[PDB]
């Protein structure tokens, strides 16, 4: 039994936390949800995801294509990609926004057993083997993966877990 419970609103918080890990630039209803999996003993958060325009968005490794219970209703997967590590439920992919490249972002981190929180940060670019990946330099536990990363205009520009390749 894999299910979703709501974590909070998707907003750019003006008085958000600011990380010391990076340098500064200059001196059905929508929201974030915890993807859970109940067991014999207790319950355990496997990931995070975004509900937007009647479509639930998360990463493939969280659910692995499993149907999600949502209180009374049930959510079947519509589309996915294993190599990109993405999956949508109830409709096609709707998060069309992207990082501009010259701005700070807010990670709306939704960690396991802990409240949702915005952390402001400048993304770095890391030359990995087989790509220059852009990433937010913030280590959160596994189960936080799928947490949305936001721009100043409120839009989800990426999901936390794996970085983003640049070509």
Binding site for ligand A1H2Z (CB under 6 A): 99, 105, 123, 133-139, 149, 157-158, 160-164
Angle of CA points 113, 15, 154, to nearest 5°: 80
In the complex with ligand A1H2Z, which residue's Cβ is closer, 28 or 103? 103
Query: Least CB distance from residue 14 to ligand A1H2Z, whole Å?
Result: 19
Query: Distance between CA atoms of 86 and 81, rounded to whole angstroms?
Result: 5
For residue 160, give the nearest of 128, 129, 121 by alpha carbon: 121
Q: Shortest Cβ distance from residue 139 to ligand A1H2Z (Å)? A: 5
**Smallest distance from the beta carbon of 19 to ligand A1H2Z, in angstroms?**
11
Residue 47 vs 75, nearer CB to ligand A1H2Z = 47
145 labelled catalytic: yes
**Catalytic residue, candidates 22, 145, 147, 151:** 145
**Least distance in Å: CB of 99 to ligand A1H2Z?**
4
Closer CB to ligand A1H2Z, 63 or 147, in the complex: 147
Q: Which residue of the set 61, 76, 96, 103 is catalytic?
A: 61
Nearest to 128 by CA among 157, 103, 158, 164: 164
Nearer to ligand A1H2Z, 61 or 69 (CB): 61
Per DSSP (E only), the strands in 53-122 are 55-58, 68-70, 73-75, 77-81, 86-89, 105-109, 117-121
- Radius of gyration of the chain from its Cα atoms, rounded to whole angstroms: 16
Per-residue tokens: 151: 């721009």
Residue 85 is a catalytic residue: yes
Per the CB < 8 A criterion, the answer to whether 146 and 58 are in contact is yes
Annotated catalytic residues are: 61, 85, 145
């Amino acid at each position: 039994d894999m299910y979703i419970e709501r974590a909070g609103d998707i907003t750019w918080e003006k008085d958000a936390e600011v990380t010391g890990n990076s340098p500064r630039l200059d001196v059905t209803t929508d929201g974030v949800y915890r993807v859970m999996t109940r067991g014999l003993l207790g319950s355990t958060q496997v990931g995070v995801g975004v509900m937007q325009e009647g479509v639930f968005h998360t990463m493939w490794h969280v659910t692995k294509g499993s149907a999600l219970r949502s209180g009374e209703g049930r959510l079947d997967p519509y589309w996915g990609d294993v190599k990109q590590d993405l999956v949508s439920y109830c409709g096609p992919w709707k998060l069309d926004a992207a990082w501009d490249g010259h701005s700070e972002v807010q990670l709306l981190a939704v960690p396991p057993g802990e409240r949702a929180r915005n952390i402001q940060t400048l993304p770095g670019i890391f030359k990995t083997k087989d790509g220059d990946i852009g990433a937010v330099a913030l280590d959160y536990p596994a189960g936080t993966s799928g947490s949305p990363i936001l721009d100043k205009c409120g839009r989800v520009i990426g999901l936390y877990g794996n970085g983003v390749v640049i070509k």
